[PDB]
Amino acid sequence: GFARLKRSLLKTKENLGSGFISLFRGKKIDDDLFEELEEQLLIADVGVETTRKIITNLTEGASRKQLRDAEALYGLLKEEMGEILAKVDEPLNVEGKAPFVILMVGVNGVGKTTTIGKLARQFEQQGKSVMLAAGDTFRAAAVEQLQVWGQRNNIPVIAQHTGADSASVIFDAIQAAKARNIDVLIADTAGRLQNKSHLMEELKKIVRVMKKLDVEAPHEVMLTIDASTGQNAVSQAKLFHEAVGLTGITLTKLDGTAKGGVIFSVADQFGIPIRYIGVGERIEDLRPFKADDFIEALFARED
Amino acid sequence: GFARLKRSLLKTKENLGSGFISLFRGKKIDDDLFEELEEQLLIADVGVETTRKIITNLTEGASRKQLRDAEALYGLLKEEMGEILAKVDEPLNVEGKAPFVILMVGVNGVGKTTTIGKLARQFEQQGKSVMLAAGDTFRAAAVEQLQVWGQRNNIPVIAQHTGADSASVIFDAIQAAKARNIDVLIADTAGRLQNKSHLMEELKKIVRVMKKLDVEAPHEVMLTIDASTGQNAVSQAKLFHEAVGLTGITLTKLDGTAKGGVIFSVADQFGIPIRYIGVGERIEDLRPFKADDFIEALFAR
Ligand code: NA
Ligand code: NA
Ligand code: NA
Ligand code: NA
Ligand code: NA
Ligand code: NA
Ligand code: NA
Ligand code: NA
């Protein structure tokens, strides 16, 4: 089963999940084994803190259960790592708001930009009217590309002049969305690396200004991160979560990267729902995250 | 991949998957909508019982999620109908036995013999040593067809005179397979429905004789059914499963039939893994079943 996701995770499966099988084959459970396993988890971008927790729990379980052969660690790992992902399994529900406001945060990258477009198309296919807000106001090329995308897809895009106040653009977009019976408003934001404190103050202002129109907005603060960036995804998540407060995460570019193990670090460190994973180029390849599908694809050696 | 499968399933997609889109466009979620959906599922040969389950789960899911637009039902249907197939998505693994024994069952006229030969060639191309047993002992053309596959591919075929005892042929074949270090043995069987009890008793006798040589044999009891026969495929599956017990299914002739929806009835009613699907007449057109490829192709918009 899960052959499509198994293909997307092919390179990640070399080191994690089914990749553990060759590591444990024929070995005893001892300090040397756990050192080798720790190294492999770290090379897979699982992260120091999450790896330490896995090793601690696995070591105690193997000891208490008096396990003898390393092969048995495979099933215990599937349980421990599966629980990590199950704890952040909760799909995004955008129903019943006028509009449901998604504030899209994260650093500048193809992932964030592409995710806005894919989600907009998915919501339209679900029968919802969508509007976009071009809140990355100092990057004229990014604003124009969003306007181009909206025109190509007949989705309205609210934008102001280069250098406009992002909170004002997004406020105006919420007003336009309410006036035009929009179901979902997706608001882009700046994602510049220099002067991190400035960006975080900008995001806090955006959120405060929204409350004049709807105390429930933003209904979702969604971070987009790129699995191929390894631990940079974790540090980005920490930065945005501590500054604004995330309610959902989209993790892109899981297909074709050997760094897919970072999903475990994101899940364990922050406990924020992972709403979607990107595993391909099609609109439909931005999938709602299902922890059971993911762990089975990762650990099963059958196709 | 899913994209290649789209062409094979075009006819089925008129009523299922992407065929749902026009049904939901612009509509509200109400009893009339679910009645219209029920009609479309039934004409696609999804079956009365499976259709009712789909509608019930879709209704409960739409209520739970507080959906407003019928368009949003499309994704829930993809999820729920995909779950039906995911439950029978375990691939066949023929490794590690001496030999792994596949007992092929089913009625005459569904291509059991040709399916055996195609699988035998595939296993050989994968590097496995294969042997075939001509257990459809009263049908000389079936024995000859199996021998043709064996002769073309240098695969041994165990056979006796027309009218021989099928259990004896298969017993001798298992003994020969063990003596010759064979990896996979595939046994053809009789398929006359005119006397259902006689056929099922013959199959049970074959199985009893196998177990005297290896308690694990047969490792797979595989049914072949023809998707273009609609609910006949479902009734055939029920007969063999309740009488003998199936562990895998090969579903042929999915390409060009508007009755491909029967796969959901087979999956839901019996829960037996669907190991392979046929989307053409060639060896290469008998593909390992991948439920996610199938759903993605069916629902692609
Ligand atoms: Na970590
Ligand atoms: Na309000
Ligand atoms: Na209803
Ligand atoms: Na499968
Ligand atoms: Na062979
Ligand atoms: Na032949
Ligand atoms: Na051949
Ligand atoms: Na058996």
Numbering used by the authors:
A (entry chain A): 195 to 497
B (entry chain B): 195 to 495
Show passages lifted from the paper.
Apo FtsYNG crystals diffracted to 1.45Å with two copies of the protein in the asymmetrical unit. The structures show the N domain of one monomer packing against the G domain of the other copy in the asymmetric unit. Also an unique αβαβ domain to the SRP GTPase family named Insertion Box Domain (IBD) is present in the G domains and is involved in 4.5S RNA recognition and interaction with Ffh as previously reported. The apo structure was then used as a search model for all subsequent FtsYNG:fragment structures (herein referred to as holo structures) using molecular replacement.
The signal recognition particle (SRP) is an efficient protein sorting system that directs the translocation of newly synthesized proteins from translating ribosomes to the endoplasmic reticulum (ER) or plasma membrane. Similarly, the eukaryotic SRP receptor (SR) consists of two proteins, SRα and the membrane-inserted SRβ, while in bacteria, a single protein, FtsY, is responsible for membrane association and interaction with the translocon. In FtsY, the NG domain (comprising of the N-terminal and GTP binding domains) is involved in binding a GTP molecule and forming a heterodimer with the NG domain of Ffh. The N domain of FtsYNG consists of a four-helix bundle (αN1−N4), while the G domain adopts a classical Ras GTPase fold in which five conserved motifs (G1−G5) are arranged around the nucleotide-binding site.
